[PDB]
Amino acid sequence: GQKIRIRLKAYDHEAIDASARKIVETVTRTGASVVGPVPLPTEKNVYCVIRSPHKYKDSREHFEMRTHKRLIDILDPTPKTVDALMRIDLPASVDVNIQ
Amino acid sequence: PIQTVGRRKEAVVRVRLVPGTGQFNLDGRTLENYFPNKVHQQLIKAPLVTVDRVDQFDIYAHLDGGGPSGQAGALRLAIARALILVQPEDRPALKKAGFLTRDPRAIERKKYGLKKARKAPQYSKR
Amino acid sequence: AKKALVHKANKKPKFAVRAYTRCNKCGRPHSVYRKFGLCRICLREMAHAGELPGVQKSSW
Amino acid sequence: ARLVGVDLPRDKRMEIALTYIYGIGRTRSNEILAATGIDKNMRTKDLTDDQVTVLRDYIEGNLKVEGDLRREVQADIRRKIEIGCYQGLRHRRGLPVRGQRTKTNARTRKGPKRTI
Amino acid sequence: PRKGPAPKRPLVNDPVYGSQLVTQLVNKVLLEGKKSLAERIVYGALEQAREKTGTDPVVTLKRALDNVKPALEVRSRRVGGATYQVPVEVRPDRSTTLALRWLVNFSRQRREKTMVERLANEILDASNGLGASVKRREDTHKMAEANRAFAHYRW
Amino acid sequence: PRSLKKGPFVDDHLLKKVDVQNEKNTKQVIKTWSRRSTIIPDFIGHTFAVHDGRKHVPVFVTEAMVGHKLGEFAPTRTFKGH
RNA sequence: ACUCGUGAGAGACUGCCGGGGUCAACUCGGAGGAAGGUGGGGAUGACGUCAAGUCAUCAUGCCCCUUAUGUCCAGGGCUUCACACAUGCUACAAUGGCCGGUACAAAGGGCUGCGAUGCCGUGAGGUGGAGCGAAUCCUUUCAAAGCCGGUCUCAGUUCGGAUCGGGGUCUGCAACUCGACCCCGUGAAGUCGGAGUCGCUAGUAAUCGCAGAUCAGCAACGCUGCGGUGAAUACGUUCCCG
């Protein structure tokens, strides 16, 4: 009747994959249908900084920040899945929200 | 079904083939309406002319990335590989002219502290 | 930065345009990124200290 | 021909020929021509009396050109250079009045170089 | 280039004529990075030559460049703060390169106010031998033969 | 330049002082430390001592210089040639 | 089924052959192959040197003020100008100038933020609001060079843009000194630049546009990136420098 997407983001690949695997296993145990964690574009923020204070501009250093994002789509909204959803433990660096 | 992919310095093309008449479709335009270059014309003719079976295939191209020459080269390579696939006997021909050698040349990074790539600011002795 | 200047920066300005960056860790008014709020020197030093969630050396 | 007592060039487009006056340049030529209705593909060689008469009628009726423009510009300048105005004092010393830079620039204002 | 000679670049065969002289010329006249405009300029000049001489462009350009192809060059060698001019023969490749460079560089001086007719006119003049490229060739040979004395350094 | 929608700029002190003066049938010398304020036609009959950083320059405004700020007629920096 | 988004893996390893080789490293040529010899580029900078730079990022020993060099506040300066140096951008045009049509890039950024349609403006823009905390919506289906058609015909030019005048828009409590942008006008220097000197060896220079950081607005032509088009020669160490 209703399908739910969950956006699922982290810098770390290990933690994000472990969270996805745990959630998929829990859904399989509960008895609900999910498409799977389809990949999404990885956002990258790029910055430049000056290595030396007080002159010598030509020497600089670049910084990055990478955020890997994915979606997990669940069909057939089994009530037990909704009951057991928010109690699932997640890694510190992984953030998941509903849509 | 047959589908082939070509790439040339950030231009990506996908080509589908039909054994139909001697005409081409480039996202809804013919070979003269789109890529209106004689040089590009011979470049795209080079595979078929080398294999000597012009006017035997109708192509349909979907294009992205790059500019005129990049997409022209990408289409050339894609159709060359497609022809090699459908008729492998012509494999020892294009390699003689080196049409199977994909071109690994791209844009070099602009390096900080300079003007661009390898260009450098003017140097004064005083 | 003088402590008086730091406190005046901590004091909210009486006009909207009278506000500036005033880097958090030190207080260097120049080159303060809005993503972090830190001056570039402090940002680089802390990032190389392994105490920021996401920052890393860039190479490409 | 003639253009408010001035000698029109023998071979110039009227959209370019009307630029030769002190008050009409690029856009005003076309605005005057459109409000008048003269075809812009001809030459001064063909410019007959009717175009000339509608032309000076329109230029009399639209704005100020030639000498009066010079004297009104001078009137504004004299208003600004004898009331203590900052722009006037900057005119007096031969320096840019728009708060420009004179450390190395403003060559066309001060003039040619006099090396010291 | 200190260790040894770098491998020579290949020349792409000209698709319309089959000889690389025309593509060399269009590559040299190229500037600001545009192949199409330079190609059309050279092709217009060649077709004006077609309609003005009635002969095949390849052969006429061939013997024109042959008649403007230099044979010897003068090189500077400095000792004790004073220079010496030594004559050295030239390989045909650099000879043709210098001839074509002279043509292109001095094709911006004809006073007929358009580049394509400039090229056509100078190509035809060099075909007739009255072009300024012939003058530079004669000057270069005068310099080479007059200063043939200073060659005992053998270079 | 200045958005005319907000109207000509005049801060309250000298406006109130000139209100007191001209409602008391009196015209005196006004000294102000403001330079950004504009020239008001009601002020044309008065004079203003405007500050340049050290002290005040007195200016007797007329109808010739209307429409400009005070500082447009009171130079600040000093340069006596080379 | 095809790019693509993102994970894992295969593959360039003198692997094979032939000549030079001391049957050696190594060098060239050839075969297959996307690439043939560290495929291309980043990151990483040993021991040492200049009593090099930074007490103004921060802390740091000694000395100094300590009712002041502390300290809040209003205006003004860091943009002042007869000069000289350095780094850049725009031009001296016909490989061009002006007018309409025409088709392909990448990356990036966006909450009191990107902000589309309509309403009215020559153009900044005033009305208000649909899509999005963002592969969803906005940066026009994302640009210019390119190509086509019209014209200008070599002049201080339908080049060039400076200085100057009148009238405005946006933001900011507040635009004169001292923000940007818009309309209109006269249109200065400027004719390929002396002695001398600079960057560069393959997708490089040269040219063209786009994006970001800081930013309410910008002096940004600056810096860090992206993509389009894209050639020349390298004989050889004699000389100049490290």
Coordinates of N, CA and C in Angstrom, one line a residue, chain E:
Chain E
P1 N 66.5 17.2 -24.6 CA 67.3 17.1 -25.8 C 68.8 17.0 -25.6
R2 N 69.2 16.9 -24.3 CA 70.6 16.8 -24.0 C 71.1 15.4 -24.3
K3 N 70.4 14.4 -23.9 CA 70.9 13.0 -24.1 C 70.9 12.6 -25.6
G4 N 69.8 12.7 -26.3 CA 69.7 12.3 -27.7 C 68.5 12.9 -28.4
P5 N 68.5 12.7 -29.7 CA 67.4 13.3 -30.5 C 66.0 12.7 -30.1
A6 N 65.0 13.5 -29.9 CA 63.7 13.0 -29.7 C 63.1 12.4 -31.0
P7 N 62.3 11.4 -30.9 CA 61.7 10.8 -32.1 C 60.8 11.8 -32.8
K8 N 60.9 11.7 -34.1 CA 60.2 12.7 -35.0 C 58.7 12.4 -34.9
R9 N 57.9 13.5 -35.0 CA 56.4 13.4 -34.9 C 55.9 12.9 -36.3
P10 N 54.9 12.1 -36.3 CA 54.3 11.7 -37.5 C 53.4 12.8 -38.1
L11 N 53.2 12.7 -39.4 CA 52.3 13.7 -40.1 C 51.1 12.9 -40.6
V12 N 49.9 13.5 -40.3 CA 48.7 12.9 -40.7 C 48.5 13.2 -42.2
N13 N 48.2 12.2 -43.0 CA 47.9 12.4 -44.4 C 46.8 13.3 -44.7
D14 N 47.0 14.3 -45.6 CA 45.9 15.2 -46.0 C 44.8 14.5 -46.7
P15 N 43.6 14.6 -46.2 CA 42.5 13.8 -46.7 C 42.0 14.3 -48.1
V16 N 42.2 15.6 -48.4 CA 41.7 16.1 -49.7 C 42.7 16.0 -50.8
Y17 N 44.0 16.1 -50.5 CA 45.0 16.1 -51.6 C 46.0 15.0 -51.5
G18 N 46.2 14.4 -50.4 CA 47.0 13.2 -50.2 C 48.5 13.5 -49.9
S19 N 48.9 14.8 -50.0 CA 50.3 15.2 -49.7 C 50.3 16.1 -48.5
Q20 N 51.3 15.9 -47.7 CA 51.4 16.6 -46.4 C 51.9 18.0 -46.4
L21 N 52.2 18.5 -47.6 CA 52.7 19.9 -47.7 C 51.6 20.9 -47.3
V22 N 50.4 20.6 -47.8 CA 49.2 21.5 -47.5 C 48.9 21.5 -46.0
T23 N 48.9 20.3 -45.4 CA 48.5 20.2 -44.0 C 49.6 20.8 -43.1
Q24 N 50.9 20.7 -43.6 CA 52.0 21.4 -42.9 C 51.8 22.9 -43.0
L25 N 51.4 23.4 -44.1 CA 51.2 24.9 -44.3 C 50.0 25.3 -43.4
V26 N 48.9 24.6 -43.4 CA 47.8 25.0 -42.6 C 48.0 24.9 -41.1
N27 N 48.8 23.9 -40.7 CA 49.2 23.9 -39.3 C 50.1 25.1 -38.9
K28 N 51.0 25.5 -39.8 CA 51.8 26.6 -39.5 C 51.1 27.9 -39.5
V29 N 50.2 28.1 -40.5 CA 49.4 29.3 -40.5 C 48.4 29.4 -39.4
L30 N 48.1 28.2 -38.8 CA 47.2 28.2 -37.6 C 47.7 29.0 -36.5
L31 N 46.8 29.8 -35.9 CA 47.2 30.6 -34.7 C 45.9 30.8 -33.9
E32 N 46.0 31.0 -32.6 CA 44.9 31.1 -31.6 C 44.3 29.7 -31.4
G33 N 44.7 28.7 -32.1 CA 44.1 27.4 -32.0 C 42.8 27.1 -32.7
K34 N 42.8 27.2 -34.0 CA 41.6 27.0 -34.8 C 42.0 26.3 -36.1
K35 N 41.6 25.1 -36.3 CA 42.0 24.3 -37.5 C 41.0 24.7 -38.7
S36 N 39.8 24.9 -38.4 CA 38.8 25.1 -39.4 C 39.0 26.3 -40.2
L37 N 39.2 27.5 -39.5 CA 39.4 28.7 -40.2 C 40.7 28.7 -41.0
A38 N 41.8 28.2 -40.5 CA 43.0 28.2 -41.2 C 42.9 27.2 -42.4
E39 N 42.2 26.1 -42.3 CA 41.9 25.2 -43.4 C 41.2 25.9 -44.5
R40 N 40.1 26.6 -44.1 CA 39.3 27.3 -45.2 C 40.1 28.4 -45.8
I41 N 41.0 29.1 -45.1 CA 41.9 30.1 -45.7 C 42.8 29.5 -46.7
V42 N 43.5 28.5 -46.3 CA 44.4 27.8 -47.2 C 43.7 27.3 -48.4
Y43 N 42.5 26.7 -48.2 CA 41.8 26.1 -49.3 C 41.3 27.2 -50.3
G44 N 40.8 28.3 -49.8 CA 40.5 29.4 -50.6 C 41.6 29.9 -51.4
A45 N 42.8 30.1 -50.8 CA 44.0 30.5 -51.5 C 44.3 29.5 -52.6
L46 N 44.3 28.2 -52.3 CA 44.6 27.2 -53.3 C 43.6 27.2 -54.5
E47 N 42.3 27.4 -54.2 CA 41.4 27.5 -55.3 C 41.5 28.7 -56.1
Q48 N 41.9 29.9 -55.5 CA 42.2 31.0 -56.3 C 43.4 30.8 -57.2
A49 N 44.4 30.0 -56.7 CA 45.5 29.6 -57.6 C 45.0 28.7 -58.7
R50 N 44.1 27.8 -58.4 CA 43.4 26.9 -59.4 C 42.8 27.8 -60.5
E51 N 42.0 28.8 -60.1 CA 41.3 29.6 -61.2 C 42.2 30.6 -61.8
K52 N 43.4 30.9 -61.3 CA 44.3 31.9 -61.9 C 45.4 31.3 -62.7
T53 N 45.8 30.1 -62.5 CA 46.9 29.5 -63.3 C 46.5 28.4 -64.2
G54 N 45.4 27.7 -63.9 CA 44.9 26.6 -64.7 C 45.7 25.3 -64.6
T55 N 46.6 25.1 -63.6 CA 47.3 23.9 -63.4 C 47.0 23.3 -62.1
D56 N 47.6 22.1 -61.9 CA 47.3 21.3 -60.7 C 48.0 21.9 -59.5
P57 N 47.3 22.1 -58.4 CA 48.0 22.8 -57.2 C 49.2 22.1 -56.7
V58 N 49.2 20.7 -56.7 CA 50.2 20.0 -56.0 C 51.6 20.3 -56.6
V59 N 51.6 20.1 -58.0 CA 52.9 20.3 -58.7 C 53.4 21.7 -58.7
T60 N 52.5 22.7 -58.8 CA 52.9 24.1 -58.8 C 53.4 24.5 -57.5
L61 N 52.7 24.1 -56.4 CA 53.3 24.4 -55.1 C 54.6 23.6 -54.9
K62 N 54.7 22.4 -55.4 CA 56.0 21.7 -55.3 C 57.2 22.4 -55.9
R63 N 57.1 22.8 -57.1 CA 58.3 23.4 -57.7 C 58.4 24.9 -57.2
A64 N 57.3 25.5 -56.8 CA 57.5 26.8 -56.1 C 58.3 26.7 -54.8
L65 N 58.0 25.7 -54.0 CA 58.8 25.6 -52.8 C 60.2 25.1 -53.1
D66 N 60.3 24.3 -54.1 CA 61.7 23.8 -54.6 C 62.5 25.0 -55.0
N67 N 61.9 26.0 -55.7 CA 62.6 27.2 -56.1 C 62.8 28.2 -55.0
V68 N 62.1 28.0 -53.9 CA 62.3 28.9 -52.7 C 62.9 28.1 -51.6
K69 N 63.3 26.9 -51.8 CA 63.9 26.0 -50.7 C 65.3 26.4 -50.5
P70 N 65.7 26.8 -49.4 CA 67.1 27.2 -49.2 C 68.0 26.0 -49.1
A71 N 69.3 26.2 -49.3 CA 70.3 25.2 -49.3 C 71.4 25.3 -48.1
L72 N 71.7 26.5 -47.7 CA 72.7 26.7 -46.7 C 72.2 27.7 -45.7
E73 N 72.8 27.6 -44.5 CA 72.5 28.5 -43.4 C 73.7 29.0 -42.7
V74 N 73.6 30.1 -41.9 CA 74.7 30.7 -41.2 C 74.4 30.6 -39.7
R75 N 75.4 30.2 -39.0 CA 75.3 29.9 -37.6 C 76.4 30.7 -36.8
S76 N 76.0 31.1 -35.6 CA 76.9 31.9 -34.8 C 77.6 31.0 -33.8
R77 N 79.0 31.2 -33.6 CA 79.8 30.5 -32.6 C 80.7 31.6 -32.0
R78 N 80.6 31.7 -30.6 CA 81.3 32.7 -29.9 C 82.5 32.2 -29.2
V79 N 83.6 32.9 -29.3 CA 84.9 32.7 -28.6 C 85.4 34.0 -28.1
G80 N 85.8 34.0 -26.8 CA 86.5 35.2 -26.3 C 85.6 36.4 -26.3
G81 N 84.3 36.3 -26.3 CA 83.4 37.4 -26.4 C 83.1 37.9 -27.8
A82 N 83.7 37.3 -28.8 CA 83.5 37.7 -30.2 C 82.9 36.6 -31.0
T83 N 82.0 36.9 -31.8 CA 81.2 35.9 -32.6 C 81.8 35.6 -34.0
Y84 N 81.5 34.5 -34.5 CA 81.9 34.0 -35.8 C 80.7 33.4 -36.5
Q85 N 80.6 33.7 -37.8 CA 79.5 33.2 -38.7 C 80.1 32.1 -39.5
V86 N 79.5 30.9 -39.3 CA 80.0 29.7 -40.0 C 78.9 29.2 -40.9
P87 N 79.2 28.9 -42.2 CA 78.1 28.3 -43.1 C 78.0 26.8 -42.9
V88 N 76.8 26.3 -42.8 CA 76.5 24.9 -42.7 C 75.3 24.6 -43.7
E89 N 75.5 23.5 -44.4 CA 74.4 23.0 -45.2 C 73.2 22.6 -44.4
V90 N 72.0 22.6 -45.0 CA 70.8 22.3 -44.3 C 70.2 21.0 -44.9
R91 N 69.6 20.2 -44.0 CA 68.8 19.1 -44.4 C 67.6 19.6 -45.1
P92 N 67.1 18.9 -46.1 CA 65.9 19.4 -46.8 C 64.7 19.7 -46.0
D93 N 64.5 18.9 -44.9 CA 63.3 19.1 -44.0 C 63.3 20.5 -43.4
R94 N 64.4 20.9 -42.8 CA 64.5 22.3 -42.3 C 64.5 23.3 -43.4
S95 N 65.0 23.0 -44.5 CA 64.9 23.9 -45.7 C 63.5 24.2 -46.0
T96 N 62.7 23.2 -46.2 CA 61.3 23.4 -46.5 C 60.6 24.1 -45.4
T97 N 60.9 23.7 -44.1 CA 60.3 24.4 -43.0 C 60.6 25.9 -43.0
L98 N 61.8 26.3 -43.2 CA 62.1 27.7 -43.2 C 61.5 28.4 -44.4
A99 N 61.4 27.8 -45.5 CA 60.8 28.4 -46.7 C 59.3 28.7 -46.4
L100 N 58.6 27.7 -45.8 CA 57.2 27.8 -45.5 C 57.0 28.8 -44.4
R101 N 57.9 28.8 -43.4 CA 57.8 29.8 -42.4 C 58.0 31.3 -42.9
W102 N 58.9 31.4 -43.8 CA 59.1 32.7 -44.5 C 57.8 33.1 -45.2
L103 N 57.2 32.2 -46.0 CA 56.0 32.5 -46.7 C 54.9 33.0 -45.7
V104 N 54.7 32.2 -44.7 CA 53.5 32.5 -43.8 C 53.8 33.8 -43.0
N105 N 55.0 34.0 -42.6 CA 55.4 35.1 -41.8 C 55.2 36.4 -42.6
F106 N 55.6 36.4 -43.9 CA 55.6 37.6 -44.7 C 54.3 37.7 -45.5
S107 N 53.4 36.7 -45.4 CA 52.1 36.8 -46.0 C 51.1 37.8 -45.3
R108 N 51.6 38.4 -44.2 CA 50.8 39.5 -43.5 C 51.2 40.9 -43.9
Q109 N 52.0 41.0 -45.0 CA 52.5 42.3 -45.4 C 51.9 42.8 -46.7
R110 N 51.4 41.9 -47.6 CA 50.8 42.4 -48.8 C 49.6 43.3 -48.5
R111 N 49.5 44.4 -49.3 CA 48.6 45.5 -49.0 C 47.3 45.4 -49.7
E112 N 46.8 44.2 -50.0 CA 45.5 44.0 -50.5 C 44.4 43.6 -49.5
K113 N 44.7 43.7 -48.2 CA 43.8 43.8 -47.1 C 42.9 42.6 -47.0
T114 N 43.4 41.4 -47.4 CA 42.7 40.2 -47.0 C 43.7 39.0 -47.1
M115 N 43.6 38.1 -46.1 CA 44.6 37.1 -45.9 C 44.6 36.0 -47.0
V116 N 43.4 35.6 -47.5 CA 43.3 34.6 -48.4 C 43.8 35.0 -49.8
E117 N 43.4 36.2 -50.3 CA 44.1 36.7 -51.5 C 45.5 36.9 -51.3
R118 N 45.9 37.3 -50.1 CA 47.4 37.5 -49.8 C 48.1 36.2 -50.0
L119 N 47.6 35.1 -49.5 CA 48.3 33.8 -49.7 C 48.3 33.4 -51.2
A120 N 47.1 33.6 -51.8 CA 47.1 33.2 -53.3 C 48.1 34.0 -54.1
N121 N 48.1 35.3 -53.8 CA 49.0 36.2 -54.6 C 50.5 35.8 -54.3
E122 N 50.9 35.6 -53.1 CA 52.3 35.3 -52.8 C 52.6 33.9 -53.3
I123 N 51.7 32.9 -53.2 CA 52.0 31.6 -53.8 C 52.2 31.7 -55.3
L124 N 51.4 32.5 -56.0 CA 51.5 32.7 -57.4 C 52.8 33.4 -57.7
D125 N 53.2 34.4 -56.9 CA 54.5 35.1 -57.2 C 55.7 34.2 -57.0
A126 N 55.7 33.4 -55.9 CA 56.7 32.4 -55.8 C 56.7 31.4 -56.9
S127 N 55.6 31.1 -57.4 CA 55.5 30.2 -58.6 C 56.1 30.8 -59.8
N128 N 56.0 32.1 -59.9 CA 56.6 32.9 -61.0 C 58.0 33.3 -60.6
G129 N 58.5 33.1 -59.4 CA 59.8 33.5 -59.0 C 60.1 34.9 -58.6
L130 N 59.0 35.8 -58.7 CA 59.2 37.2 -58.4 C 58.8 37.5 -56.9
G131 N 58.4 36.5 -56.1 CA 58.0 36.7 -54.8 C 59.2 37.1 -53.9
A132 N 58.9 37.7 -52.7 CA 59.9 38.1 -51.8 C 60.6 36.9 -51.1
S133 N 60.0 35.7 -51.1 CA 60.6 34.5 -50.6 C 61.9 34.2 -51.4
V134 N 61.8 34.4 -52.8 CA 63.0 34.3 -53.6 C 64.0 35.3 -53.2
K135 N 63.6 36.5 -52.8 CA 64.6 37.5 -52.3 C 65.3 37.1 -51.1
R136 N 64.5 36.6 -50.1 CA 65.2 36.1 -48.9 C 66.1 34.9 -49.2
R137 N 65.7 34.0 -50.1 CA 66.5 32.9 -50.5 C 67.8 33.4 -51.0
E138 N 67.8 34.4 -51.9 CA 69.0 34.9 -52.5 C 69.9 35.6 -51.5
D139 N 69.2 36.3 -50.6 CA 70.0 36.9 -49.5 C 70.7 35.9 -48.6
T140 N 70.0 34.8 -48.3 CA 70.6 33.8 -47.5 C 71.8 33.1 -48.2
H141 N 71.6 32.8 -49.5 CA 72.8 32.3 -50.2 C 73.9 33.3 -50.4
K142 N 73.6 34.5 -50.5 CA 74.7 35.5 -50.5 C 75.4 35.5 -49.2
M143 N 74.7 35.5 -48.1 CA 75.4 35.4 -46.8 C 76.2 34.1 -46.6
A144 N 75.7 33.0 -47.1 CA 76.4 31.8 -47.0 C 77.7 31.7 -47.9
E145 N 77.6 32.2 -49.1 CA 78.7 32.1 -50.0 C 79.7 33.2 -49.7
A146 N 79.3 34.4 -49.3 CA 80.2 35.4 -49.0 C 81.1 35.1 -47.8
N147 N 80.5 34.5 -46.8 CA 81.2 34.2 -45.6 C 81.6 32.7 -45.5
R148 N 81.9 32.1 -46.7 CA 82.4 30.7 -46.7 C 83.8 30.5 -46.1
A149 N 84.5 31.6 -45.9 CA 85.8 31.5 -45.4 C 85.9 30.9 -44.0
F150 N 85.0 31.4 -43.1 CA 85.0 31.0 -41.7 C 84.3 29.7 -41.5
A151 N 85.0 28.6 -41.8 CA 84.4 27.3 -41.6 C 85.4 26.3 -41.0
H152 N 86.6 26.8 -40.7 CA 87.6 25.8 -40.2 C 87.3 25.2 -38.9
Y153 N 86.3 25.6 -38.2 CA 85.8 25.0 -37.0 C 85.1 23.6 -37.3
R154 N 84.7 23.4 -38.5 CA 84.1 22.2 -39.0 C 82.8 21.9 -38.2
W155 N 81.8 22.7 -38.3 CA 80.5 22.5 -37.7 C 79.4 23.1 -38.6

